[PDB]
Each structure stands twice: as structure tokens, then as C-alpha cells.
Amino acid sequence: VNSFSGYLKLTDNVYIKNADIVEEAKKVKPTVVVNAANVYLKHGGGVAGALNKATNNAMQVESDDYIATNGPLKVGGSCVLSGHNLAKHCLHVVGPNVNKGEDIQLLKSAYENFNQHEVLLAPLLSAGIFGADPIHSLRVCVDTVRTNVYLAVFDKNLYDKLVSSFLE
Ligand SMILES: [Cl-]
Numbered sequence: 223v224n225s226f227s228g229y230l231k232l233t234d235n236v237y238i239k240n241a242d243i244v245e246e247a248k249k250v251k252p253t254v255v256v257n258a259a260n261v262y263l264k265h266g267g268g269v270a271g272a273l274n275k276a277t278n279n280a281m282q283v284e285s286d287d288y289i290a291t292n293g294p295l296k297v298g299g300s301c302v303l304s305g306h307n308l309a310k311h312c313l314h315v316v317g318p319n320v321n322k323g324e325d326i327q328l329l330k331s332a333y334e335n336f337n338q339h340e341v342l343l344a345p346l347l348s349a350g351i352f353g354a355d356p357i358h359s360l361r362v363c364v365d366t367v368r369t370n371v372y373l374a375v376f377d378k379n380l381y382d383k384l385v386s387s388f389l390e
Pocket of ligand 1: 229230231
């Protein structure tokens with residue numbers, strides 16, 4: 223388990239790779255994979271949809287059962303559900319959706335969820351459909367997360383921008 227290879231160490235506890243999170247989960251066998259969740263755990267798009275498709279919809283079936291009994295998450299919150307075939311656990315984390323007017327401040331709360339897990343495979347929170355500046359997201363990750371985080375960024379141009387930004 224947790225066989226991370228070819229990462230670039232940014233800080234003592236934050237690592238980055240130009241890779242697909244689904245392919246990483248299959249290769250690494252992480253204890254924890256982070257999902258870029260929404261409050262209703264509806265995994266139709268973005269990273270959530272890629273993770274769910276890689277579980278052959280088992281993540282969505284479990285999520286729908288969870289929500290019907292347990293209610294929604296909060297923005298900046300998390301829950302731990304099964305990792306199915308991808309990981310032991312999936313930490314579903316809700317970053318703010320700034321495209322929909324949610325407070326970017328909540329990205330700090332979102333990343334604080336990572337500190338309950340010693341090592342995580344994760345995407346950049348509030349990227350993509352959530353609309354936040356990826357350079358900002360990496361800074362909040364570095365400033366907030368104290369446990370070991372392995373970030374997978376699949377877009378090569380974005381990866382290059384993040385690494386260039388970080389090394390300034
Ligand atoms: Cl390195």
C-alpha cells in the first residue's frame with residue numbers, strides 16, 4: 223500500500239505528480255483517496271465522476287444510501303466512506319464552488335479535513351467545475367495540510383504552471 227512513485231517534493235509533506243488520480247489509485251493502492259465532492263455526494267462530473275466510473279458506480283450507490291439517512295455535508299466538510307477498488311477509504315471533501323458564489327475562505331476548512339489521515343492521494347481542491355484559482359488552492363494546501371499529501375494533476379499545462387508558481 224501507499225506505493226507513490228515519481229512525485230516531486232514541494233514541501234516536507236506536500237508532493238505533486240502530473241498524473242491521472244484514477245491511474246494513481248490503481249498503481250499506488252493508497253489507504254485514502256480524496257474525492258472532490260459536493261454536499262449531496264452526487265458524483266456525475268469532475269474528479270468525482272472519474273472516481274465513481276472507476277468504481278463501476280459503487281461509490282454513487284453507497285453515497286446515495288449515505289445521504290438519504292445522514293443528510294448532506296457542509297461546504298468545507300468531509301465524510302469517510304469506502305474506497306471500493308481504489309483505496310481502503312475515500313475521504314469525500316467539499317471545497318467551495320466559487321463558480322456558484324461560495325466563499326473561497328472555506329478552502330482552508332476543506333484542506334483541514336486532510337489532517338485526520340497520515341497519507342492521502344488527492345486532487346487539487348476547488349479546481350475544475352468548482353472554479354477556484356489552482357495556484358491559490360496549492361498555497362492553501364501547503365499552508366494548511368500537516369499530513370502527507372500526494373497531489374495528482376492530470377493537465378500537463380496546469381501542472382507546469384503550478385510547479386513554476388511554487389518554485390518562485
Ligand atoms: Cl523530489
